[PDB]
């Protein structure tokens, strides 16, 4: 019998998936054109 | 429709008619001398 290393509840892992995943979403802003004008047409149109 | 009420009042309408399926724009009468049409008198397309 030997200590056996602390494995970190399988809810942290999952929670993980849950935070990245949250920021992935509004990162994107949709595309229309590459780079330039894709979902950020609707900040430039107000801008102008 | 110089004035940027007017370009406005469409990109607010196509906004809501993606948003809640409701979107609209008016038309409202007043006195420019800044770009008179005709009598320094002209109207306007006022957002919804």
Known sequence: ?48 | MRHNTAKIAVNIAVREQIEAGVGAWRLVTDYEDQSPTSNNQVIRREPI
């Open chain 1, 1 to 48: 019998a030997y200590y056996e290393n602390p494995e970190v509840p399988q809810a942290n892992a999952y929670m993980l998936e849950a935070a990245t995943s949250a920021v992935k979403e509004v990162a994107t802003l949709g595309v229309d054109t590459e780079a330039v004008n894709g979902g950020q047409v609707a900040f430039d149109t107000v801008n102008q």
